[PDB]
């Protein structure tokens, strides 16, 4: 859930790969995770977030890549 090449960590454990999207516009990467209402152990839950990061100057927008860990941590990275 921090920022550390350029890379960002992020916890999205409650979201599935098809509920996440990553997009780059205007030197800004935008991360959105959305799931419609689904039953859980306690009742029904729907979640949504949008997270934006400004890309560092050197970074090429076309080279930015993303990968979701299977235990629910999303990383986004690029090199300069």
């Amino acid at each position: 859930s921090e920022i550390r090449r350029w890379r960002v960590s992020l916890d999205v454990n409650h979201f599935a790969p098809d509920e996440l999207t990553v997009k780059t516009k205007d030197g800004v990467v935008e991360i959105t995770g959305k799931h419609e209402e689904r039953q859980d152990e306690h009742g029904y839950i729907s979640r949504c977030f949008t997270r934006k990061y400004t890309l560092p100057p050197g970074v090429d927008p076309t080279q930015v890549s993303s990968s979701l860990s299977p235990e629910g941590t999303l990383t986004v990275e690029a090199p300069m």
Partner: peptide, 7 residues
Amino acid sequence: ITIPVTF
């Protein structure tokens, strides 16, 4: 799981 990135 290498998720896409659109621009």
